[PDB]
Design a protein around this ligand. Structure first.
Ligand SMILES: [K+]
Ligand SMILES: [K+]
Ligand SMILES: [K+]
Ligand SMILES: [K+]
Ligand SMILES: [K+]
Ligand SMILES: [K+]
Ligand SMILES: [K+]
Ligand SMILES: [K+]
Ligand SMILES: [K+]
Ligand SMILES: [K+]
Ligand SMILES: [K+]
Ligand SMILES: [K+]
Ligand SMILES: [K+]
Ligand SMILES: [K+]
Ligand SMILES: [K+]
Ligand SMILES: [K+]
Ligand SMILES: [K+]
Ligand SMILES: [K+]
Ligand SMILES: [K+]
Ligand SMILES: [K+]
Ligand SMILES: [K+]
Ligand SMILES: [K+]
Ligand SMILES: [K+]
Ligand SMILES: [K+]
Ligand SMILES: [K+]
Ligand SMILES: [K+]
Ligand SMILES: [K+]
Ligand SMILES: [K+]
Ligand SMILES: [K+]
Ligand SMILES: [K+]
Ligand SMILES: [K+]
Ligand SMILES: [K+]
Ligand SMILES: [K+]
Ligand SMILES: [K+]
Ligand SMILES: [K+]
Ligand SMILES: [K+]
Ligand SMILES: [K+]
Ligand SMILES: [K+]
Ligand SMILES: [K+]
Ligand SMILES: [K+]
Ligand SMILES: [K+]
Ligand SMILES: [K+]
Ligand SMILES: [K+]
Ligand SMILES: [K+]
Ligand SMILES: [Mg+2]
Ligand SMILES: [Mg+2]
Ligand SMILES: [Mg+2]
Ligand SMILES: [Mg+2]
Ligand SMILES: [Mg+2]
Ligand SMILES: [Mg+2]
Ligand SMILES: [Mg+2]
Ligand SMILES: [Mg+2]
Ligand SMILES: [Mg+2]
Ligand SMILES: [Mg+2]
Ligand SMILES: [Mg+2]
Ligand SMILES: [Mg+2]
Ligand SMILES: [Mg+2]
Ligand SMILES: [Mg+2]
Ligand SMILES: [Mg+2]
Ligand SMILES: [Mg+2]
Ligand SMILES: [Mg+2]
Ligand SMILES: [Mg+2]
Ligand SMILES: [Mg+2]
Ligand SMILES: [Mg+2]
Ligand SMILES: [Mg+2]
Ligand SMILES: [Mg+2]
Ligand SMILES: [Mg+2]
Ligand SMILES: [Mg+2]
Ligand SMILES: [Mg+2]
Ligand SMILES: [Mg+2]
Ligand SMILES: [Mg+2]
Ligand SMILES: [Mg+2]
Ligand SMILES: [Mg+2]
Ligand SMILES: [Mg+2]
Ligand SMILES: [Mg+2]
Ligand SMILES: [Zn+2]
Ligand SMILES: [Zn+2]
Lengths: 104, 245, 112, 87, 51
RNA sequence: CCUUGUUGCUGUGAAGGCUGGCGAAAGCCAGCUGGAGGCGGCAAGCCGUAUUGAUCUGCAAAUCAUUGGCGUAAGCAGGGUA
RNA sequence: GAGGAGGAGAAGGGUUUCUUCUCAUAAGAAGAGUGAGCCGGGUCUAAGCGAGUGUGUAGAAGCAUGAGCGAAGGAGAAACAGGUUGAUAUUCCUGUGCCUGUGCUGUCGUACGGCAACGUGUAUUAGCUUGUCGACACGAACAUCUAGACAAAGCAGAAACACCUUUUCUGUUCAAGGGGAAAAAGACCACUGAGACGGAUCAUCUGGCGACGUGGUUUUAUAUCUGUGACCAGGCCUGAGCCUGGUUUGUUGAGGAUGGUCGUCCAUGAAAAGACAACUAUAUGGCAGCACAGUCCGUACCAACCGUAUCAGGACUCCAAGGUGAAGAGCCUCUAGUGGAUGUUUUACACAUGUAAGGGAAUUCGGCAAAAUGGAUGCGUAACUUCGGGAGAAGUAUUGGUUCAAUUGUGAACUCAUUGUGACAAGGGGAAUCUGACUGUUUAGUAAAAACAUAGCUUCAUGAAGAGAGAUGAAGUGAGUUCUGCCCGGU
RNA sequence: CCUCGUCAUUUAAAUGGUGACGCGCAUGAAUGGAAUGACGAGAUUCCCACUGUCCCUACAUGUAGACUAGCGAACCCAUUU
């Protein structure tokens, strides 16, 4: 079985130096570089990952279409559907108590 | 001879580092506030947990650190200064709190930010209010009684993390982790096991001190080792304390 | 601020003053180019890849070399690569926008 | 479970360290690992994150507590005194 | 090795041009009295201290 | 002190869990599941007990052979800093 | 013998690399050789260092604040195949691309859908504020993918043939970019309304703060296709070009990658540059073609490094085939790489090793050295103990080849001239006493220990803090069990 | 210290080992005293197995060594021995 050399950079096996083995049209087995995985947004209240948005690294994320980075609601990314339902209710119910305390 | 271990470890390059610190711990300065508890966190060198608070100063949001009392939670609203209610975790002027109550983080003079009771499991007791002089007597966890003016502030509860000294450290590595952030030498080599160039207890054909271990308060610094200015020694019973408020 | 500058790539440092009289023509096309190189190594590059090779002044850069060629010899340039050699000479390689013209310019200039 | 007569959770240590010390450690070690009841949601899902900080695995609330138990003896008493002050 | 600074490279370039014998025509000149160039070096016998 | 790299094969089988039996109760006995430990035998490595072996104009101004001690960790190591 | 005497990088060296000639040879002389927007430096900040200014000094040192600096292995926009030289190549040549900006010409835009979970639409600058990304310990088990390795069939070429053999060997390829599933694992939305009870994992567990069920919404790989043909094998001719193949299935599987769980801690495991969303204003903005731009420095070679040398020493990392076996152990082979002070059968004494009648420590300060035991399976296991251990205690038996049953428990028969963990690998065991509780550490180069450390125990001083008595420092004794008597005359 | 203390056991035979005894030259309580378990490349005595350690030595192998080609030193030295 054919064995590999490091084509570029350092041999020292840090997080930025992941590699995989690949077979070429010329029938050689060579190392090729790998980019790191990405984490997408977590909710600002509960720590849950937001639905409807992609996971990518900051530079690659910025080059995608805006639709990959939001949902069409009051808080776009930012917060999940349950947390917005709570926020909408809370603001309403507080105003009604103040209404009563003003009228009485 | 040469300089002893006790002096070398007091030089500046040996002082504790602050790079992992969260900030300076202490009360806000304002006459009244409403605060929210944002997070409860561990800080690398300290066994009692810290609480991050958020309060408005002018229009702007500002952040502070308190030591956590037991029974707060993330999201709780707390009331600071004059006109706060007697509820667990509020901060109040000392003259408002009834006798026999337990308090933490007491200011020694107004607006100092809180000193006194700050270690896990500790509290102070309010023992007397004097309506003429506007003084209050507090009993500290050493047993000492001290007088503070009624305008000083204090936190209502016991400091979190009590009970920690119940579990013995059975192994050498467990002690290693505890002393890694402190200033004391660990492991500690005994002075009688050194040569006379290194320590006043060194040397001789048997391991012994050879001279009395009780030393004067006014002795020169590079030989002030042993029991410094001891009033008595040994395992026998002492005498009655004298007490005034 | 003063520092030993041992890791730096540019050996100059100081900003330069004005002067009462200034030198006539300045750093200019006929100071930039030294000579074209014609030997068995260079000949292949003219015949196969439409590129000439030249020795250039130490103070020169890619943009200056591009201008100077279009001024002295007259053909239009696609690319310039540069190489500092172990013998203390900066070499430049110039590829022309049309091949074939490389053999015309080389022969007129007596390089080949 | 409970395959040993006396040694309990301290069986991990074999014949090393003293007998008397192990039976003090045991109290704390059994207390640390248990799940406890949540005040906010009623479920038995509370566990220790770090000394002094306790946390619910369902609803996410964090609360200050003791080193080896969520509520200490001094707290159970003092909490009552405050409720009387409010009267 | 392959990685070098600009300052180290110029030291090597200069150390390499100086390392040459007396040219063979000079020996014929009436006034010339040198036998061998005593400043010649070998990589096996001395260090440059370019570091 | 700051930023990093480096755990392969095997033995024993703690806490917690499920079935079946015994008991008025409290809680006892089997079989299985689970995988803790500055815990055992080894590998790569790190070390330096014995032969008072070889060598002592040495391969070497401290090395070599066989034999040994630890090896899931108060373990070993590069660079930056004090 | 794939934890290589193989193929490559770093630190260190500096032309030692390639061609020609000459011996002068680990020797010289003369030439030639290192090409980048996409690889690394120049950027950000760690621990930390610091010009100037203030205070101080005869001048200094020191102390307060602080521009600038601080990682070729931490963070950090964008490239891959195939060819070419005597010597360079993700840098040159051909092909297909991508990032950041600039300009021309066309062509469209100023909004909607779903009960909802959310979708359709490549969208401008600017600003508050709130949040996210960058951005992170160790250990264990379980899934899924990819390299790799096997076995059948097909074809092409090889090896072997006194005999036998469809026996044996080598091949059967597909990059970045573009398009794209089923699957598995989790979140969530609508209807529904469940218990002394259902659901679910290898293991924990889970439900009126909404179970099972029936329909959906979304996040995370990979296979497959295109990449316009290159490349490989074979045949025919040849100082050149033609022709034919590159087809199918099963088993296994990382020392690489990823996912959601679980455990441990008086230990809870970096920053910043640079980004993004929501909200508010404001709008000539999106896409396709064509064109232009992207500076400066490093790039050869190492078996050539440090030890006065062509020195059995020392010296940071990466990739890794088949058999035997639990096992990158030892032993044997494939790919790739390798070697000289000459002849002589050469006494004695040596240094590395073999074997030995009868006796069995009589030897010697002393069983020092050597021998003996050794893996797996079963039977059987004492005193004492902190009840965990002692414990592989001790003591005993079995083991190869063949042909069968039975399906993980294993049985049975036949066979051999010394018997079978056959080579290689691989514990000697028991009874007592002194001493240190244990793992750990030490006199680099004559001492590894009973010495040091350690957990635990006791005493002392303090309300001063960027630290606040469950704290911060100073001493002594040495885990646990059981005890710790008397003396304040001297110092 | 006297000292190879006296008595018992282990051997054919014990300046040794273990068990007892005690006016102990000069034992002794955190200058820590006493009795055990698990663990030591720690010090010491005995038994079983095993053997060229020994009685008492013999034979054989590899590499050096003797002789031969090529290459080629040093310590030391009043020297007549
Ligand atoms: K979306
Ligand atoms: K310390
Ligand atoms: K000493
Ligand atoms: K002494
Ligand atoms: K002592
Ligand atoms: K004395
Ligand atoms: K270098
Ligand atoms: K050199
Ligand atoms: K285990
Ligand atoms: K020796
Ligand atoms: K040699
Ligand atoms: K071999
Ligand atoms: K990091
Ligand atoms: K090109
Ligand atoms: K085949
Ligand atoms: K690895
Ligand atoms: K290169
Ligand atoms: K193998
Ligand atoms: K196997
Ligand atoms: K292997
Ligand atoms: K093997
Ligand atoms: K003997
Ligand atoms: K003797
Ligand atoms: K000996
Ligand atoms: K008992
Ligand atoms: K035993
Ligand atoms: K056996
Ligand atoms: K062997
Ligand atoms: K020890
Ligand atoms: K160990
Ligand atoms: K040792
Ligand atoms: K003492
Ligand atoms: K101590
Ligand atoms: K004791
Ligand atoms: K006295
Ligand atoms: K006295
Ligand atoms: K005797
Ligand atoms: K005797
Ligand atoms: K005495
Ligand atoms: K005494
Ligand atoms: K005493
Ligand atoms: K030892
Ligand atoms: K012989
Ligand atoms: K010879
Ligand atoms: Mg002294
Ligand atoms: Mg002592
Ligand atoms: Mg370049
Ligand atoms: Mg592991
Ligand atoms: Mg171990
Ligand atoms: Mg080994
Ligand atoms: Mg050492
Ligand atoms: Mg010795
Ligand atoms: Mg091997
Ligand atoms: Mg080897
Ligand atoms: Mg050469
Ligand atoms: Mg780059
Ligand atoms: Mg910088
Ligand atoms: Mg980096
Ligand atoms: Mg090359
Ligand atoms: Mg790419
Ligand atoms: Mg190269
Ligand atoms: Mg014999
Ligand atoms: Mg015999
Ligand atoms: Mg004798
Ligand atoms: Mg021996
Ligand atoms: Mg005894
Ligand atoms: Mg040890
Ligand atoms: Mg030594
Ligand atoms: Mg030694
Ligand atoms: Mg000691
Ligand atoms: Mg004790
Ligand atoms: Mg007791
Ligand atoms: Mg004897
Ligand atoms: Mg005796
Ligand atoms: Mg004594
Ligand atoms: Zn949320
Ligand atoms: Zn809860």
């Amino acid at each position: 079985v054919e064995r590999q050399v490091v084509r570029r950079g350092s041999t020292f096996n840090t997080r930025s130096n992941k590699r995989k083995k690949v077979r070429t049209p010329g029938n050689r087995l060579v190392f090729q570089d790998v980019k790191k995985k990405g984490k997408g947004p977590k909710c600002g209240q509960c720590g849950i990952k937001l639905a409807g948005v992609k996971e990518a690294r900051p530079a690659a994320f910025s080059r995608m279409r805006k639709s990959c980075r939001k949902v069409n609601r009051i808080l776009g990314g930012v917060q999940c559907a349950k947390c917005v339902q709570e926020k909408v209710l809370d603001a309403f119910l507080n105003a009604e108590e103040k209404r009563m305390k003003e009228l009485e | 001879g040469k300089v002893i271990r006790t002096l070398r470890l007091q030089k500046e390059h040996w002082k504790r580092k602050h790079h992992k610190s969260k900030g300076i711990v202490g009360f806000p300065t304002l006459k009244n506030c409403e605060a929210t508890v944002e997070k409860i966190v561990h800080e690398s060198g300290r066994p009692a947990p810290l609480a991050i608070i958020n309060y408005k100063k002018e229009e702007k949001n500002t952040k502070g650190l308190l030591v956590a009392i037991e029974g707060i939670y993330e999201g709780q609203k707390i009331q600071i200064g004059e006109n706060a209610s007697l509820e667990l975790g509020n901060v109040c002027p000392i003259k408002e709190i009834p006798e026999g109550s337990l308090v933490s983080m007491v200011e020694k003079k107004p607006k100092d930010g809180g000193k006194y009771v700050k270690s896990p499991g500790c509290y102070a007791t309010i023992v007397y209010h004097n309506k003429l002089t506007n003084q209050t007597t507090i009993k500290l966890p050493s047993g000492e009684r001290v007088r503070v003016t009624g305008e000083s502030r204090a936190l209502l509860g016991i400091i979190a993390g009590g009970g920690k000294d119940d579990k013995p450290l059975l192994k050498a590595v467990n002690a290693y982790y505890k002393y890694k952030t402190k200033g004391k030498p660990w492991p500690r080599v005994r002075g009688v096991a050194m040569n006379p160039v290194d320590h006043p207890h060194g040397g001789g054909n048997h391991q012994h001190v050879g001279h009395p271990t009780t030393v004067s308060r006014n002795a020169p610094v590079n030989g002030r080792v042993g029991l410094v200015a001891a009033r008595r020694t040994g395992r026998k019973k002492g005498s009655r304390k004298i007490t005034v408020n | 601020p003063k520092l030993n500058r041992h890791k730096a790539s540019r050996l100059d440092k100081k900003i330069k003053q004005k002067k009462l009289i200034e030198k006539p023509l300045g750093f200019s096309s006929l100071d930039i180019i030294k000579y074209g190189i014609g030997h068995e190594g260079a000949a292949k590059l003219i015949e196969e890849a439409g590129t000439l090779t030249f020795v250039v002044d130490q103070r020169a850069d890619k943009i200056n070399v591009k201008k100077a060629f279009e001024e002295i010899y007259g053909e239009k340039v696609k690319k310039v690569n540069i190489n500092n050699t172990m013998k203390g000479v900066k070499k430049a390689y110039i590829r022309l926008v049309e091949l074939g013209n490389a053999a015309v310019v080389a022969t007129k200039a007596g390089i080949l | 479970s409970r395959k040993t007569k006396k040694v309990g959770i301290t069986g991990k240590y074999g014949s090393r360290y003293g007998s008397s010390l192990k039976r003090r450690a045991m109290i704390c070690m059994n207390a640390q690992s248990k799940r406890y009841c949540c005040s906010f949601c009623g479920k038995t899902t509370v566990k220790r994150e770090v000394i002094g900080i306790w946390s619910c695995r369902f609803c996410g609330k964090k609360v200050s507590g003791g080193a080896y138990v969520p509520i200490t003896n001094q707290q159970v008493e003092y909490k009552q005194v405050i409720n009387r002050m409010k009267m | 090795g392959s990685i070098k600074t600009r300052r180290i490279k110029v030291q090597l370039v200069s150390a390499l041009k100086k390392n040459r014998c007396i040219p063979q025509w000079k020996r014929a000149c009436p006034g010339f009295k040198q036998q061998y160039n005593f400043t010649k070096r070998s990589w096996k016998r001395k260090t440059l201290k370019a570091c």
